[PDB]
Design a protein around this ligand. Structure first.
Ligand SMILES: [Zn+2]
Ligand SMILES: [Zn+2]
Lengths: 141, 144
């Protein structure tokens, strides 16, 4: 599950949403989803889940992003899908390359793993691809 | 997460595996996976997860199979994904079946839940299925 505050970009509208707002309002937004080959595609959210308050850990990525998710949340890495709790400094996660062009994914090293924290968590179902970019990182849905 | 003992059907070999054996041996078995349009395909397991001991509930499906999963595990229904813990007796779940006369040949069919069993503690596991992110466990299409 992803923590409250997680930013999700809707490529069809240009709006960046906070996951808790998407779930609380059952907003049918589109997200940046990753296909098996690494290409990105806009896919609609079809299910919304308020997963309650749970423990989450943080992955500070080279570049500035800090992904907060439960230890069992799956993240796309250089070695495929791995649980956030299994990752450590040095491991690389998948991130979309800048949309302005200045092929579509890049792997960034985890700067540091942050200690467990209590937070409201959520989940979304993304049609067909079951993935989405959250806090600048390709994560599992 | 799925409980120890969960039977996973490999449509390629025809073999049925216990999920804990698949995870403990990181076996790249194939599973019956459902695509967006409901069609079924053989897809390989690419990741294995030992999720530790968690609370799991049980759903006995028409036919006799019993799916033991955490209440938050997503199950495929004609209305989309639903948390196992929200399903009740009589609700229908996706259960692939081959033509009996009464891309894979299996057709996506639906079967009713005959009984909901009380929560219990059990070792749990999870699997990642290439591309489609779904698989058949205890004959029911569940979320991966
Ligand atoms: Zn999904
Ligand atoms: Zn998956």
């Amino acid at each position: 599950c992803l923590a409250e505050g997680t930013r999700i970009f809707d490529p069809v509208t240009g709006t960046t949403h906070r996951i808790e707002d998407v779930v609380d309002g059952r907003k049918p937004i589109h997200v940046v989803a990753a296909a098996k080959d690494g290409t990105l595609h806009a896919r609609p959210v079809v299910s919304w889940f308020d997963q309650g308050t749970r423990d989450v850990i943080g992955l500070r990525i080279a570049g500035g992003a800090i992904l907060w998710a439960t230890p069992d949340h799956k993240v796309l890495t250089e070695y495929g899908w791995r649980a956030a709790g299994e990752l450590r400094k040095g491991d690389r996660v998948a991130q979309p390359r800048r949309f302005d062009g200045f092929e579509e994914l890049r792997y960034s090293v985890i700067r540091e793993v942050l200690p467990t924290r209590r937070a409201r968590t959520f989940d979304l179902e993304v049609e067909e691809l079951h993935t989405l970019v959250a806090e600048g990182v390709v994560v599992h849905n």
